[PDB]
Design a protein around this ligand. Structure first.
Ligand SMILES: *[C@@H]1O[C@H](CO)[C@@H](O[C@@H]2O[C@H](CO)[C@@H](O[C@@H]3O[C@H](CO)[C@@H](O)[C@H](O)[C@@H]3O)[C@H](O)[C@H]2NC(C)=O)[C@H](O)[C@H]1NC(C)=O
Ligand SMILES: *[C@@H]1O[C@H](CO)[C@@H](O[C@@H]2O[C@H](CO)[C@@H](O[C@@H]3O[C@H](CO)[C@@H](O)[C@H](O)[C@@H]3O)[C@H](O)[C@H]2NC(C)=O)[C@H](O)[C@H]1NC(C)=O
Ligand SMILES: *[C@@H]1O[C@H](CO)[C@@H](O[C@@H]2O[C@H](CO)[C@@H](O[C@@H]3O[C@H](CO)[C@@H](O)[C@H](O)[C@@H]3O)[C@H](O)[C@H]2NC(C)=O)[C@H](O)[C@H]1NC(C)=O
Ligand SMILES: *[C@@H]1O[C@H](CO)[C@@H](O[C@@H]2O[C@H](CO)[C@@H](O)[C@H](O)[C@H]2NC(C)=O)[C@H](O)[C@H]1NC(C)=O
Ligand SMILES: *[C@@H]1O[C@H](CO)[C@@H](O[C@@H]2O[C@H](CO)[C@@H](O)[C@H](O)[C@H]2NC(C)=O)[C@H](O)[C@H]1NC(C)=O
Ligand SMILES: *[C@@H]1O[C@H](CO)[C@@H](O[C@@H]2O[C@H](CO)[C@@H](O)[C@H](O)[C@H]2NC(C)=O)[C@H](O)[C@H]1NC(C)=O
Ligand SMILES: *[C@@H]1O[C@H](CO)[C@@H](O)[C@H](O)[C@H]1NC(C)=O
Ligand SMILES: *[C@@H]1O[C@H](CO)[C@@H](O)[C@H](O)[C@H]1NC(C)=O
Ligand SMILES: *[C@@H]1O[C@H](CO)[C@@H](O)[C@H](O)[C@H]1NC(C)=O
Lengths: 423, 89, 100, 50, 50, 44
């Protein structure tokens, strides 16, 4: 018969970082294997359409990466704007909203994320090029801004139909009902909640600013693709059994009948290097696709709604989420309600009054040692146990652990006062 | 056509000098050469009117065949219609 | 072959912690501090979750506990008597052994 | 082949972690996600490699 | 106008088995290809960083 | 949109009027009290 019930709460903001896209690469198979060498190219033709398959695999990856970015961020039909007066019940969103004074119009947090993670082929000029993404960083920031403005001014309604404006504190009140806490808890404590939110956001900036490893998930993607390309270029210096790694030297010193042997050895080595590179890129692309699909699911369920999936949208009971753009990925700020300062109370499954078994409609019966009250499960708020708060099913001889207490009938009390005097 | 990763000046010079490896040529007249981050786009007139993306090119630029007779145009793609929500207390 | 970082005992300890949390605190340990609740009341809340009132559980608490205990015994009999029950894990072991 | 199987195992592990969070540390209203029927509760058990 | 309503219920327990981890392997590339052979190792070096 | 009269059946009470920000003044109709003033309006 012992139950603990939170008497306070904390608004917590946590960060989830997910890759969305990968560097899009393109390889000129002939230049890589047989750079500016007719004799090598003519020998390369005897291996069939391998360069063509490699071209399709890399093109398919590049297209998929643009699909992944589009699927994660372009989830809003319209580009929403916040009002000129950025007052939302006392909730300060200035560190997640676009900063209009800076070029690129990114929020302070997005600018930090872009500064922490690190067109002309100056490097790796061996047939290996990088294609730009279809959406620019500014376009991604604009989608993020639209999603954020939608959530702040319209709540969850913009994600399932037209955007419907609602005062922010009432949006929060609905989110509180979602987790299972009544609206009056929010309204009575609105200033406390706004202050806890603002503090948590400041902590997010301090955490990202002071922790170099915070964005490791995105940096690892950048590092792995850079390493893959550096390895692919390094394989060109290998001899693979040939007298020289340079085709110009082989053609310069040897007659065609010998050069073809040395060239074929190099063609085999370079072709194997390209197949290894492309296979690894296909595997990483599949991994990124899975991550992007998770990010898109989280965008739809955490940002454009309220999720009741445990730990899906941060640790704690989910209230709301806000997206932020990051290089090659997305960062979600998950705002949750965390119970705090629980108190230890006596409980019972039912109250026995006049032989009837009374069960709570929305809550748990608790006792502060001497008196029985009905409370909401997630926030201590004792109320008198009445026939409005409970329902009756069966008698007192069935429920195990039933305790004896008065249930107050609101109407019967009137019957004994309204005509107490008879006349 | 799009020449990837190159400055339009370098392409124009390579064309003038008869140095460019592919032997076909695109008319490359005034206002049909547009510099993008993806590369040098030749054969499409750039306009300041955004539209939904049709054929992607890159770095925010898409091209489409539009009536303006009809020709291929390049534009910065639109992300969506603007809707300012009437938020109040 | 490299050993795993967590030993079988450590995994068993995590499983035990998760089970003790669920049994004594219900769903509260997964979203904040663990809050004790009597088990039949946890079940009552779970019944409200599916859309059945609390009195159904309390009136039939003995029946429900007996059905649960019987079902667990059946789980042990099913796993004990069916060699193929764990095929999903054995296939992973067999495929990596075959690859090597 | 090990990279491909590793990706398959990763997907399985991600599903198992999702199920741990939603079935064991909560109550799920997703149909057939946490067993057949209306979900009440789940209990994890350790197994070799799973 | 016909509806069916359960008058009783069954508590059912089912089992879901998921892989979580794979055997962790490590390969000494040089010993496998060129086991304890200097001549082979020196030839192996010509294939680059495979 | 389906407007209904605000009554004690539709709302719940928690605290006083000096805590909630943006509270407005309006009548909440008590369904039972109206009967108390009609059922024995005449006293006899
Ligand atoms: C919403 O929160 C932000 C902070 O997250 C508040 O920004 C405040 O902006 C003012 C003016 O830019 C800052 O004042 C000055 O900052 C510099 C450092 O940049 C400092 O050296 C000066 O002494 C002075 O403090 C102020 O510090 C900054 N607040 C914080 C906490 O850093 C913004 O005002 C808040 N908006 C609303 C509507 O409450
Ligand atoms: C529930 O918890 C919150 C904290 O999460 C409690 O509010 C906190 O109350 C303490 C004590 O009243 C405040 O500390 C004081 O702050 C002032 C700020 O000027 C300072 O001058 C004092 O010396 C002292 O440190 C604290 O700031 C306040 N926190 C917030 C975020 O408002 C709240 O009272 C608790 N409620 C219950 C019912 O116990
Ligand atoms: C709802 O279904 C349950 C079964 O899931 C019913 O309970 C079962 O009732 C039968 C008949 O009363 C019990 O069988 C008897 O069991 C005793 C055990 O000692 C045995 O000696 C008798 O010969 C007979 O087999 C059965 O055990 C019992 N099962 C459980 C799990 O309690 C229940 O009555 C049904 N309720 C309604 C409202 O129909
Ligand atoms: C349990 O709660 C009741 C009700 O809040 C407490 O009794 C009240 O105490 C206040 C003083 O704090 C009195 O003014 C009220 O008249 C009391 N009400 C009743 C119905 O007796 C009670 O003291 C609390 N007990 C414990 C152990 O915390
Ligand atoms: C709740 O109150 C009822 C009625 O006062 C108690 O029921 C009585 O319990 C005594 C126990 O010795 C019996 O002898 C009486 O015959 C019972 N009366 C009735 C009308 O049932 C009940 O025990 C009380 N429960 C608790 C938990 O104190
Ligand atoms: C709602 O009604 C109450 C009571 O009529 C108003 O409260 C009064 O407000 C005036 C404002 O000048 C004060 O001088 C009185 O002392 C208040 N009386 C009481 C009993 O509190 C309240 O202002 C009204 N609210 C609105 C929004 O109009
Ligand atoms: C809860 O309260 C009871 C007394 O009502 C006390 O004996 C018990 O120790 C308390 N629980 C804890 C965890 O201390
Ligand atoms: C192209 O070259 C000119 C100089 O000839 C330079 O001013 C311009 O910025 C370059 N453009 C690009 C896109 O590199
Ligand atoms: C909302 O109320 C605040 C109270 O300070 C006020 O400053 C703000 O201008 C009001 N907003 C609107 C849209 O009237």
């Amino acid at each position: 018969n012992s139950i603990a019930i939170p008497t306070n709460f904390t608004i917590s903001v946590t960060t989830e970082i997910l890759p969305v896209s990968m560097t899009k690469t393109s390889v000129d198979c002939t230049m890589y294997i047989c750079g500016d060498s007719t004799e090598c190219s003519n020998l390369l033709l005897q291996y069939g359409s391998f360069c063509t398959q490699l071209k399709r695999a890399l093109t398919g990856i590049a297209v998929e990466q643009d699909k992944n970015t589009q699927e994660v961020f372009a989830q809003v039909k319209q580009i929403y704007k916040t009002p000129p007066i950025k007052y939302f019940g006392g909730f300060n969103f200035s560190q997640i909203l676009p900063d209009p004074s800076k070029p690129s119009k990114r929020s302070p947090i997005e600018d930090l994320l872009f500064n922490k993670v690190t067109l002309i082929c100056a490097q790796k000029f061996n047939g290996l090029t990088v294609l730009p993404p279809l959406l620019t960083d500014e376009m991604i920031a604009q989608y993020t801004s639209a999603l954020l403005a939608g959530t702040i001014t319209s709540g969850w309604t913009f994600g399932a139909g037209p955007a419907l404006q609602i005062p922010f504190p009432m949006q929060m009140a609905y989110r509180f009902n979602g987790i299972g806490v009544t609206q009056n808890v929010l309204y009575e404590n609105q200033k406390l909640i706004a202050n806890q939110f603002n503090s948590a956001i400041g902590k997010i900036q301090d955490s990202l600013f002071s922790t170099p490893s915070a964005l490791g998930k995105l940096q690892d993607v950048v590092n792995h693709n850079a390493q893959a390309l550096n390895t692919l270029v390094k394989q060109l210096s290998s001899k693979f059994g040939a007298i020289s790694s340079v085709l110009n030297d082989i053609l310069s010193r040897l007659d065609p009948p010998e050069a073809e042997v040395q060239i074929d050895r190099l063609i085999t080595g370079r072709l194997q290097s390209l197949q290894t590179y492309v296979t690894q890129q296909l595997i990483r692309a599949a991994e990124i696709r899975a991550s992007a699909n998770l990010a898109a699911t989280k965008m739809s369920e955490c940002v454009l709604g309220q999720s009741k999936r445990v730990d899906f949208c941060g640790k704690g009971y989910h209230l709301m989420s806000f997206p932020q753009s990051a290089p090659h990925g997305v960062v979600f700020l998950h705002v949750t309600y965390v119970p705090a300062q629980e108190k230890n109370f006596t409980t019972a499954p039912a109250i026995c009054h006049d032989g009837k078994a009374h069960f709570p409609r929305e809550g748990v019966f608790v006792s502060n040692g001497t008196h029985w009250f009905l409370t909401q499960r997630n926030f201590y708020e004792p109320q008198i146990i009445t026939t409005d708060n409970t329902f009756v099913s069966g008698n007192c001889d069935v429920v195990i652990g039933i305790v004896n207490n008065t249930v107050y009938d609101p109407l019967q009390l009137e019957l004994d006062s309204f005509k107490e005097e008879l006349d | 056509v799009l020449y990837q990763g190159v400055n339009c000046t370098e392409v124009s010079v390579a064309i003038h000098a008869d140095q460019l490896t592919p032997t076909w040529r695109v008319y490359s007249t005034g206002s049909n050469v547009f510099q993008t981050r993806a590369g040098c786009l030749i054969g499409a007139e750039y306009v300041n009117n955004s539209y939904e993306c049709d054929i992607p090119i890159g770095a925010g630029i898409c091209a489409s065949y539009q009536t303006q007779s009809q020709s291929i145009i390049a534009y910065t793609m639109s992300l969506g219609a603007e809707n300012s929500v009437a938020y109040s207390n």
